[PDB]
């Protein structure tokens, strides 16, 4: 019943903007959309064993699409853009 910080972080964001930020040790994550910056700053420090400088967040509404059964709508996401401390080990995000 007890919590676990791997529930907050969902997936890493895989795009060419996110690829460019990794060179400056800036990691982008899809997080659970009802979580705040301090949870993300405590969870990232506990999972990857690293010191975290700042966490920025952004909500994004889902795209509305056209289908012959009507308009539909994709899910809405929240991104966490995590900057590491000056002199920390890089997050091994496996790719």
């Amino acid at each position: 019943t007890l919590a676990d910080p791997r529930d907050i972080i969902l997936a890493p964001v895989i795009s060419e903007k996110s690829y460019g930020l990794l060179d400056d040790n800036v990691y982008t994550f899809l997080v659970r959309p009802d979580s705040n910056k301090t949870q993300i700053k405590i969870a990232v420090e506990k999972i990857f064993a690293v010191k975290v400088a700042s966490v920025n967040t952004a909500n994004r509404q889902g795209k509305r699409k056209r289908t012959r059964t009507g308009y539909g709508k994709r899910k809405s996401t929240k991104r966490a853009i995590v900057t590491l401390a000056p002199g920390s080990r890089p997050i091994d995000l496996f790719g």
Partner: protein, 68 residues
């Protein structure tokens, strides 16, 4: 992992199985994002064995065949 073999883990041997199956599911969610997971049936299974440990822990704290 069978339900009949989780009932012999005592009280916190289950709680470490839950803790290391959620890391199992966490690493699988990163392999799908990076395009690096092949057996995509593995995500469905690990969610079930997390759901199965939570059933056994709740049966113990409701008297429904409690015991180590």
């Amino acid at each position: 992992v069978s339900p009949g073999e989780l009932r012999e883990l005592t009280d916190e041997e289950l709680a470490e199985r839950l803790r290391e199956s959620k890391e199992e599911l966490f690493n699988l969610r990163f392999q799908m994002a990076t395009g690096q997971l092949n057996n995509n049936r593995r995500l469905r299974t690990v969610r079930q064995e997390i759901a199965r440990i939570y059933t056994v822990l709740r049966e113990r704290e409701l008297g429904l065949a409690t015991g180590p």
